[PDB]
Amino acid sequence: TTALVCDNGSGLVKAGFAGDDAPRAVFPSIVGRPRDSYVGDEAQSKRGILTLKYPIEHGIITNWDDMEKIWHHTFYNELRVAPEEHPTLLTEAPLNPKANREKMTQIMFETFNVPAMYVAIQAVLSLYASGRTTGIVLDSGDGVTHNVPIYEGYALPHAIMRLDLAGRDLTDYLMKILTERGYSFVTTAEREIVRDIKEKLCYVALDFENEMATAASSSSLEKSYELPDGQVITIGNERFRCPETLFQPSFIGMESAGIHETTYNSIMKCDIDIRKDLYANNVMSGGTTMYPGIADRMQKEITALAPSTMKIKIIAPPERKYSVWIGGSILASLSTFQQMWITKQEYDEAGPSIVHRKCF
Amino acid sequence: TTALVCDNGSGLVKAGFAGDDAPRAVFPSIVGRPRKDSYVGDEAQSKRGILTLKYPIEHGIITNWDDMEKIWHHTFYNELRVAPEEHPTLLTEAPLNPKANREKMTQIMFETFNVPAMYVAIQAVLSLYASGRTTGIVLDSGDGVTHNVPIYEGYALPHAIMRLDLAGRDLTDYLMKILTERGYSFVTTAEREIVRDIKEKLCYVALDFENEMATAASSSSLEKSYELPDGQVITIGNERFRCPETLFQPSFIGMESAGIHETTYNSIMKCDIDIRKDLYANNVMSGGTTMYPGIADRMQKEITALAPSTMKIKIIAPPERKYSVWIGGSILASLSTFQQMWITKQEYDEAGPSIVHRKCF
Numbered sequence: 200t201t202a203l204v205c206d207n208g209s210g211l212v213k214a215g216f217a218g219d220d221a222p223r224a225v226f227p228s229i230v231g232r233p234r235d236s237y238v239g240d241e242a243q244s245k246r247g248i249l250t251l252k253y254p255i256e257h258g259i260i261t262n263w264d265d266m267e268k269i270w271h272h273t274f275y276n277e278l279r280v281a282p283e284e285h286p287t288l289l290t291e292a293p294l295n296p297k298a299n300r301e302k303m304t305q306i307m308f309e310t311f312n313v314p315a316m317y318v319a320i321q322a323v324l325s326l327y328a329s330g331r332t333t334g335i336v337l338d339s340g341d342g343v344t345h346n347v348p349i350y351e352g353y354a355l356p357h358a359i360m361r362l363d364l365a366g367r368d369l370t371d372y373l374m375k376i377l378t379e380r381g382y383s384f385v386t387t388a389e390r391e392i393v394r395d396i397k398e399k400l401c402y403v404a405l406d407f408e409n410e411m412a413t414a415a416s417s418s419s420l421e422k423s424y425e426l427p428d429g430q431v432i433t434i435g436n437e438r439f440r441c442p443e444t445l446f447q448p449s450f451i452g453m454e455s456a457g458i459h460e461t462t463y464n465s466i467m468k469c470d471i472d473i474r475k476d477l478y479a480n481n482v483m484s485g486g487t488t489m490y491p492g493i494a495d496r497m498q499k500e501i502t503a504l505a506p507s508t509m510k511i512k513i514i515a516p517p518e519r520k521y522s523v524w525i526g527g528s529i530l531a532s533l534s535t536f537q538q539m540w541i542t543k544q545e546y547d548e549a550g551p552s553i554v555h556r557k558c559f
Numbered sequence: 560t561t562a563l564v565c566d567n568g569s570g571l572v573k574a575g576f577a578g579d580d581a582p583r584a585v586f587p588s589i590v591g592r593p594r595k596d597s598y599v600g601d602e603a604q605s606k607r608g609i610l611t612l613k614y615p616i617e618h619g620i621i622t623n624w625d626d627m628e629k630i631w632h633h634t635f636y637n638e639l640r641v642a643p644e645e646h647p648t649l650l651t652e653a654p655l656n657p658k659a660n661r662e663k664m665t666q667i668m669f670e671t672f673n674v675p676a677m678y679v680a681i682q683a684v685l686s687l688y689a690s691g692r693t694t695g696i697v698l699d700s701g702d703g704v705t706h707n708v709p710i711y712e713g714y715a716l717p718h719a720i721m722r723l724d725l726a727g728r729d730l731t732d733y734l735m736k737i738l739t740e741r742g743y744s745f746v747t748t749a750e751r752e753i754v755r756d757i758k759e760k761l762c763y764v765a766l767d768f769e770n771e772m773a774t775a776a777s778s779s780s781l782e783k784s785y786e787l788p789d790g791q792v793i794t795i796g797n798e799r800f801r802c803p804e805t806l807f808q809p810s811f812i813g814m815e816s817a818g819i820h821e822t823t824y825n826s827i828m829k830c831d832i833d834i835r836k837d838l839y840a841n842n843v844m845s846g847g848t849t850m851y852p853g854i855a856d857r858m859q860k861e862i863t864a865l866a867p868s869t870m871k872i873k874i875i876a877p878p879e880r881k882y883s884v885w886i887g888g889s890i891l892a893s894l895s896t897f898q899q900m901w902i903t904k905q906e907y908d909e910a911g912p913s914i915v916h917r918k919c920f
């Protein structure tokens with residue numbers, strides 16, 4: 200028997216087979232209905248004739264009807280497997296309401312007739328993937344950013360921090376600042392171009408003020424980008440100003456602490472005896488941690504905030520845009536895990552509330 | 560960086576690389592010295608006519624440290640052919656292994672073999688891991704000893720461990736005895752090795768011992784022949800199932816002890832009432848001496864007779880269970896989540912051998 204791993208995010212579904220090194224399928228977490236339902240790439244490419252909805256907001260499922268459509272699409276159209284044949288591992292946001300875990304469980308067993316399933320916390324999976332069971336994860340995706348401190352596979356809920364700024368906000372901000380430069384990025388098609396610019400050319404400056412000074416004095420930091428129609432544009436300080444928003448949320452009008460401060464504050468909410476282990480094991484996860492320079496910059500910022508004697512290590516694996524998924528693949532393909540699944544039998548005997556006993 | 564997994568048993572060493580599906584090297588845990596200074600394993604055995612042979616491990620516990628060092632040296636340099644300084648090494652240990660022994664093993668690995676990192680895992684827990692479980696009760700029967708080890712959520716329950724002081728070597732000796740009663744003769748090492756081969760190839764556990772005896776007596780339907788390298792032939796009938804029947808009836812070799820079904824039952828019944836149901840449904844067989852065809856079905860029948868009438872009982876006997884400890888070690892040492900669990904050379908330098916008690920569970 201082979202397990203499936205489905206990592207449902209605010210912007211992207213990552214899905215595949217346990218044991219694989221990477222997801223087989225990655226697609227937009229979008230359901231389109233006429234202005235009877237389309238999912239993913241097709242929903243996107245038919246936007247003109249459709250109303251589009253994102254069933255997951257800031258990592259939490261908020262539209263169960265549309266979520267069922269995402270899962271149906273995942274099984275039948277992307278992975279192309281019969282769900283009744285596969286134990287299925289799903290992932291969940293930090294601080295996911297208990298009722299949501301039950302609803303995921305009920306839908307899996309009742310709608311999709313899975314023989315077995317499990318729900319794991321996304322940040323814990325990314326930690327596992329990095330080669331640890333203790334550390335603090337900064338997970339930053341398309342819609343939300345969290346700090347999750349974890350001790351021996353257990354997330355410490357009182358110290359979890361949530362920042363409602365992530366990749367989609369950074370894309371919107373890059374569109375704004377490139378428009379201020381004198382370009383015009385406003386439409387949905389122009390948003391896809393800017394997303395590509397963001398993913399290809401942006402970086403986190405080690406010293407932001409110095410970098411702004413460098414950008415002002417020479418073209419040394421400038422990069423050309425060819426637009427779909429052939430026109431070549433210049434991206435300058437926008438390259439590092441865009442992800443600087445993560446450290447300075449006031450750039451997009453948010454009063455919030457930046458990701459260095461949320462990391463520090465998370466650590467400080469934990470018991471003093473475990474803080475040392477957390478500083479030494481700060482793991483970055485998710486697409487919005489992919490910026491070159493982010494690890495170097497976090498190391499510097501955390502050092503400035505931490506006790507002078509504190510050993511600080513930032514771990515940013517090259518594969519971290521899929522580390523949640525990879526952690527799920529490791530867990531779901533592990534021999535010992537085969538006893539951890541909620542079985543169809545157990546669900547029939549106990550109902551959806553079995554999830555709280557079996558997963559956690 | 561690839562880890563090494565070395566499972567040291569009373570009779571056999573199983574050794575290889577983490578991530579592999581089977582040990583690369585399996586050889587006798589024996590050191591011979593003249594009646595070259597010392598010989599190990601395969602070579603010691605062949606030269607035994609001019610050597611005194613000793614087993615440095617007895618009932619799973621190291622009792623001769625000079626000879627154990629020679630076994631580890633042979634494993635690293637002659638069998639695996641690696642430089643130990645390049646490989647984190649996972650070792651295994653028996654139930655109730657003395658703290659002093661765990662310390663001395665740790666000292667030897669870091670100071671003599673210069674390993675970069677090391678870990679010691681409980682053998683029965685590794686076997687359970689390999690079977691796909693962290694809760695269950697393991698019957699581990701090897702060359703020198705048999706244990707039941709109940710395990711709950713990844714931890715062995717030492718208050719409920721049971722031991723039976725017979726295993727594979729005793730079954731070989733018993734088979735030799737009953738084959739000698741047939742007029743066959745086994746005096747040389749070569750001939751005694753023949754008996755071991757017959758045991759490993761032709762023996763099985765009868766579902767109902769008395770019925771099977773009756774069958775063997777009324778027809779030739781259960782007979783098998785074994786051809787020796789020199790032309791001689793051994794024919795065997797009820798000896799096929801009388802030999803491993805000893806596991807269920809230790810009186811066969813003059814022991815008063817409970818048989819493996821009763822030790823398994825006794826072990827479960829020493830555990831907390833609220834976990835017994837989980838143990839009954841997860842009896843995992845481990846070790847070379849559980850390899851007998853028929854053993855799972857016989858255990859199912861015997862346990863069913865002892866347990867409450869409504870108890871769900873399941874016996875799990877993985878096909879490569881003669882190496883399940885090793886395989887569980889391979890799984891563990893190659894697992895991402897285990898990578899901070901190793902004792903590092905740095906931790907050893909700073910803490911000394913007692914570090915093993917703080918790190919290894």
Ligand SMILES: Nc1ncnc2c1ncn2[C@@H]1O[C@H](COP(=O)(O)OP(=O)(O)OP(=O)(O)O)[C@@H](O)[C@H]1O
Nearest residue numbers: 208209210211340341342343366398485486487489
């Ligand atoms: N190389 C890159 N550089 C910068 N950003 C990137 C890169 N690759 C992907 N991203 C961004 O990462 C985001 C998607 O990441 P991820 O799949 O981790 O999010 P998600 O799970 O869909 O969302 P969330 O975790 O917020 O619920 C998108 O905003 C995308 O533009």
Ligand SMILES: Nc1ncnc2c1ncn2[C@@H]1O[C@H](COP(=O)(O)OP(=O)(O)OP(=O)(O)O)[C@@H](O)[C@H]1O
Nearest residue numbers: 568569570571701702703704727759846847848850
């Ligand atoms: N297929 C088989 N059938 C019966 N017996 C077997 C088979 N394969 C191996 N054996 C026996 O298993 C024994 C070795 O098993 P194992 O390697 O588990 O023991 P060990 O670890 O050396 O000893 P212990 O666990 O007692 O310290 C030997 O007695 C061998 O003859």
Ligand SMILES: OCCN(CCO)CCO
Nearest residue numbers: 332333350351352353896
């Ligand atoms: O810290 C190790 C424990 N961990 C094992 C999962 O791989 C979760 C159980 O608590």
Ligand SMILES: OCCN(CCO)CCO
Nearest residue numbers: 535693694711712713714
């Ligand atoms: O349920 C047990 C969890 N764990 C043991 C933790 O040390 C097994 C992880 O492979």
Ligand SMILES: [Sr+2]
Nearest residue numbers: 208209321340
């Ligand atoms: Sr995510």
Ligand SMILES: [Sr+2]
Nearest residue numbers: 224225226240
């Ligand atoms: Sr795709």
Ligand SMILES: [Sr+2]
Nearest residue numbers: 263264267310
């Ligand atoms: Sr419905």
Ligand SMILES: [Sr+2]
Nearest residue numbers: 308309310312
């Ligand atoms: Sr149904």
Ligand SMILES: [Sr+2]
Nearest residue numbers: 567568569701
């Ligand atoms: Sr053994």
Ligand SMILES: [Sr+2]
Nearest residue numbers: 669670671673
């Ligand atoms: Sr040395």
Ligand SMILES: [Sr+2]
Nearest residue numbers: 767768769861
């Ligand atoms: Sr009987």
